[PDB]
Design a binder for this molecule. Structure first.
Ligand SMILES: [K+]
Ligand SMILES: [K+]
Ligand SMILES: [K+]
Ligand SMILES: [K+]
Lengths: 308, 308, 295, 295
């Protein structure tokens, strides 16, 4: 079965993550919920709509959530890359706010059956926990793509999804549900190598082309500032985890969030020190199983086929 | 008319505030919403129920809101003082969460017609703004009892309602609605002097006795640590303001909230310095009109009469 | 009698405080120390030399102390002892009997702090500390902080946290020390080059500041610190606890005082409140007369 | 040749670092400075005197520096120059040619910081700074911070922010410097009271720490700093920017390094990574031999 709710801010990675989730047979996408990111909530939502349509997704609500972080200010493109949007989408946005939507699903289903998988800022997730504390013990677990125990990108020590809303992050990590942090340390191992891209080209389906198109567009921009032999895809990793834990190793360690540091704001602070606790609701992802991971993505694509 | 929503955490002051609001003919109480305080959300809510019943209030929802602050931990009695609760209340709690309730009222009414009057931590108010940004331009204004520009109590520089949830406070003060801060600087002038208490005793109504009972109980505890000739009542002041601005002087000054200080956490930072801006959505209360203020309370009592 | 060590970052008010220090009989000026202020240490030292000459002061060593705050980046005739203010300070205190000197800082506390940490024995020989810094319900560098504290918050934290007796002559008081027209008169009619040197300075930096807007009158600050020394009776004080904010984003460098009431009996800090305009001004004036004309 | 000034807070590792400093031919030990550490300055000085005797060291001045961190509250035969480490330090640097000494701090940076602020001319005479402090992906005092940094964060901030060349021999490296059984052998077979004095100390503080749990082996830290001096080749280093966290609640005192990649060409800081166990240990050992038996 494996029922989830994908909370994301569709830029390249979220799209793959949506594709994988939609395409993998062990996942049941209950919803796609959206959150402000490096692009506005409105833009990110269209993007999600765009993907939904490409992948041929149906009967899965896409709800927009929070347009700004809890407390911090964000204080700072045509379609998605070179892909134009149709004048109108097939898939529309619900009117329930992602937050309100997440609480109902959770509360309307059996306990410990839904996994939350956030791939952007933690704001909706945080709001929902604070708004309906009951959802924290119902949820099966929280598997998120974010943070980095020994690696940063937004900064020397910090990861985007976290620095974006450190309080929401603080809320989420300190609630009691079980939390799996799939951070930069793992994700950086997820390289779309030439052989992989080739394999993708071989699938020859609209969605596969679309994927490569957006990969190409973003990769260039990225691998254009400096040099990346290859770019890594992050978000899908979280989903891959729910499909099959064994796809990476994890470590049980306490992780909390820095809200006050000048240099270390948003750092996901991990304590791998001498006595490791007996009871810890947090864990970090360490090693990726490359072949299995990319097998999963390729599989999802083959199954999606050419919808429409 | 004067439609409001009273967001409070009923301990002594909130009760008077509810009495005044219910009893004054220029106020239309749309709702009583509850928030975690120095007592748990559950306890505070009963207290509100208790008052509602004493005052003979009807058709005004009492909704419970947030049970903890946004990010901080609170990390720390029989009826209400000597007053016992009945086995069951006449007034029940809605099921809409205060937050959800505040958004509907606001959104279901004409723009700029509802005044928010928070008398406890700002958590519900903050949650609702973040959850439905639209409510910020609809609301007439926000008149809150909290803060202190030159006076603290929770600490040397800080006031309870603010130190309790500094982020919620930060959210509220930084949103764009018009905000009137009725802080310790004003409130401390609101003394229940012997003559006043006498005047209250002269009203001779159940609600008046009840008031004195709770006044007495809390006053003793308070005026028992050290010496208060008289205790001041805070919360009602906010309400008095909406009934009639002229009851106190205010000053337009920018006010923001300290979230990082070691000594100054939660301080409502006010800038009364050399060029005062031309456009400022914040203002502070400075001088109380004692006679008019206590006249208002005495009036409300006379009008409430003896309900039931 | 009073022995002091006026620590400062000469510019308008320091200058005056210096004059009043010198020209007042009950003040014995062991030394004039220098600290980086709005201006570069160098400039502040020259300045201090200028004024010294101007006041016809001799036998008072003029030492330059620190040129950058402890941790923060500033970010925006008579000679100079080779002594670094800090060492000079230490000796003077080690070199005299206990509780006889009073430290009179009128810039940031960076020499004072350094000195307390280098030789700790001085906080308990020092008679008491009297600074012109802070504001308990007033700010200038910010809504809440004052120029002297915020420049070197750590330093200030240190000083305020030492066990010695500190008297904070903050903005709350100092904003009473007005330079009003009538005053500009009796000063004018003293006719000493210093008296003039006063108004010259009073005015230049009188306007500028009044210039942005409309400080109907100006106020001196630095002197008030001396004033109190000379005659504690000159202004009122409340003994309240005081500490320095180092981490607030809005409140950095705020002199935080607790006036809440239960009041402790054992308080080593206190704050200036009400000033006796008259007494104050006289003092200043007498001193100007007394200096006469520096041969 | 190498002239250094081993700044330290003697306890187990300092002790060794001292031995290796003395007993190594290429090291010329201008002085031994002392700084408050886990122990009181006093105790740390005595200790240093003990060891000095023990090593049969003479002509090396032993000065006590600061007894409390700059701002934070700690909170929980051979004689002592009357020189305060800080002054002593300043002279030595002012008293010799440019770029000839290397500062080797192995406690908190509070004397180094103070000294940089008192006489600024030293950051540009000093050859380079080599400290045993920090951790870039490792912590001991906390998940992320190391004992030497967190003790005096400001001080460390200062040092790391000065323009001089800093080499941080942090936990990442130092946790390689293991005291393994075989090692405990060749040491045992040196048969000098110092050699013994080593294991005596090695063991007492060997167990204790291994005692809480199970440091199969122990590691020395302080020495590694010396080691590098003696032969930079002894361990690898990466030139990355490094700064000190002063305000994080979880991250205070963290040595924050940026390994992100675009890498600047003009970096004055660098970090220790891989150690040559062998080369390291030899060094230590040779030094023990060379000391022979302190007459
Ligand atoms: K994302
Ligand atoms: K209240
Ligand atoms: K000054
Ligand atoms: K050490």
């Amino acid at each position: 079965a494996k029922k989830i709710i994908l909370d994301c801010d569709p830029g390249l990675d979220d799209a793959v993550a949506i594709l994988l989730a939609h395409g993998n047979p062990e996942i049941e996408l209950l919803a796609i919920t959206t959150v402000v990111g490096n692009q506005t909530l409105a833009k990110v939502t269209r993007n999600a709509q765009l993907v939904a349509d490409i992948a041929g997704i149906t009967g899965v609500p896409i709800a927009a959530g929070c347009d700004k972080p809890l407390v911090r200010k964000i204080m700072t493109e045509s379609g998605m890359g070179t892909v134009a949007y149709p004048a109108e989408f097939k898939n529309k946005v619900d009117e329930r706010h992602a937050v309100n939507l997440i609480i109902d699903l959770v509360m309307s289903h059996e306990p410990k059956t839904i996994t939350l998988v956030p791939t952007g800022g933690l704001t909706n997730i945080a709001m929902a926990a604070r708004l309906e504390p009951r959802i924290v013990d119902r949820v099966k677990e929280v598997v998120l793509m974010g943070g980095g125990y020994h690696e940063g990108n937004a900064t020397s020590v910090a990861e985007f999804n976290i620095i974006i809303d450190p309080e929401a992050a603080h809320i989420v990590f300190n609630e009691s549900w079980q939390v799996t942090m799939v951070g930069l340390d793992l994700t950086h191992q997820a390289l779309a190598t030439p052989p992989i891209l080739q394999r993708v080209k071989e699938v020859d389906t609209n969605p596969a082309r679309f994927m490569l198109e957006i990969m190409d567009y973003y990769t260039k921009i990225y691998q254009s500032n400096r040099y990346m032999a290859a770019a890594a895809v992050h978000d899908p990793c979280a989903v891959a985890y729910v499909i099959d834990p064994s796809v990476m190793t994890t470590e049980r360690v306490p992780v909390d969030i820095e809200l006050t540091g000048k240099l270390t704001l948003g750092m996901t602070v991990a304590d791998f020190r001498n006595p490791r606790p007996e009871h810890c609701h947090t864990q970090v992802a360490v090693k990726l199983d490359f072949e299995k991971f990319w097998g999963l993505v390729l599989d999802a694509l083959e199954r999606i086929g050419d919808p429409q």
